[PDB]
Design a protein around this ligand. Structure first.
Ligand SMILES: NC(=O)c1ccc[n+]([C@@H]2O[C@H](COP(=O)(O)O)[C@@H](O)[C@H]2O)c1
Ligand SMILES: NC(=O)c1cnc(OC2CCCC2)nc1N
Length: 313
């Protein structure tokens, strides 16, 4: 037989090994083991959880399939507000942004450049390493609590590597290939298609039945922390490294540019690589890298003064 005692220990072992495999596959996009190895262990875990349902834990990989059905979403306040971004549309707009930054700071300034992921802004809160809240940006100060749905998003860690208390923010999006596939499925079932993957991702995260959301193939890129916790980064480039280090999925295409000249070249570089990417972007986000200089520039009412988004038409 398998006793409750033996199963309690073995279950944790399985959770640890499977989540590590899930990390490599969904977060690093680089699995280490063949699928059949994962499926075999996963099946063993499912058997144990079926026999002893009390052994089911929130960080168990079986829970990714969802199950809960909400009546509605609760309000999710952001005490550290989630701002939006000021826009630029021309090479002149970007150089003018740089001129304003140098005027305010008084010296040449480095920019961390990121692809602008076209999706839904999310905030992920963790207590002692445990996922405890997921939320939409909403209006910047109050969004929707979509914790249950984001449990189904495989790149989102249910328990972090270290027991750290942090809230991080990024983009949840639907990959192109999944957008294509979902719309076909809607065509088959007599449904209106989504106009674009941004809309598909937003309609997905608005679903109240978490079982549907788990089927929707959503993914994430994290790019900032609202509350730092123990985190050590002093620059945006450092933050992105640290975010990867504690277990989040980050976008590999960011670059540290030491002149506005390098910024526009980045912009031209990816303005064309755009088509080759598995996800949609609507532009590029230019951030003053040093956090000390970001604080110095501060925020307007709408947006940070230390950033600008170059939009593609
Ligand atoms: N490390 C791996 O090879 C790995 C990890 C997670 C999921 N998968 C694959 O993804 C598919 C669905 O798995 P999950 O819904 O449990 O994530 C399965 O076919 C599974 O084999 C593979
Ligand atoms: N859509 C994106 O990919 C994206 C959006 N926003 C930001 O930075 C904002 C975060 C709060 C102040 C600057 N970075 C991004 N990469």
């Amino acid at each position: 037989p398998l006793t409750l005692t033996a199963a309690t220990t073995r279950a944790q072992e399985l959770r640890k090994q499977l989540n590590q495999y899930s990390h490599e596959y969904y977060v690093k996009d680089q699995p280490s083991v063949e699928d059949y190895v994962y499926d075999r262990l996963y099946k063993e875990l499912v058997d144990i959880e079926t026999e002893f349902p009390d052994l089911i834990t929130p960080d168990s990989p079986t829970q990714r399939v969802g199950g809960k059905v909400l009546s509605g979403f609760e309000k999710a306040p952001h005490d550290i507000p989630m701002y939006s971004l000021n826009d630029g549309f021309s090479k002149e707009d970007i150089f003018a942004f740089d001129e304003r930054v140098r005027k305010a700071i008084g010296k040449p300034v480095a920019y961390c450049c990121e692809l602008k992921i076209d999706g839904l802004a999310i905030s992920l809160r963790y207590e002692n390493g445990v996922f405890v809240r997921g939320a939409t940006r909403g209006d910047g100060t109050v969004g929707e609590n979509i914790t249950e749905n984001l449990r189904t998003v495989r790149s989102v860690p249910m328990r972090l590597t270290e027991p750290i208390s942090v809230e991080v923010r990024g983009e949840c999006y639907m990959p192109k290939q999944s957008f294509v596939a979902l719309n076909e499925e809607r065509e088959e079932n007599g449904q209106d298609i989504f106009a674009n993957p941004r809309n598909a991702a937003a309609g997905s995260l608005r679903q109240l039945d978490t079982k549907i959301v788990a089927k929707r193939n959503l993914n994430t890129f994290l790019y900032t922390v609202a509350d730092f916790g123990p985190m050590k980064a002093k620059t945006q480039f450092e933050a992105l490294e640290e975010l990867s280090a504690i277990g989040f999925r980050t976008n590999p295409e960011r670059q540290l540019c030491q002149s506005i000249d390098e910024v526009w070249a980045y912009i031209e570089e990816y303005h064309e690589k755009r088509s080759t990417l598995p996800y949609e972007i609507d532009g590029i986000v230019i951030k003053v890298n040093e956090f000390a200089l970001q604080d110095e520039l501060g925020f307007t009412v709408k947006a940070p003064r230390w950033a600008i988004a170059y939009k593609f038409p």
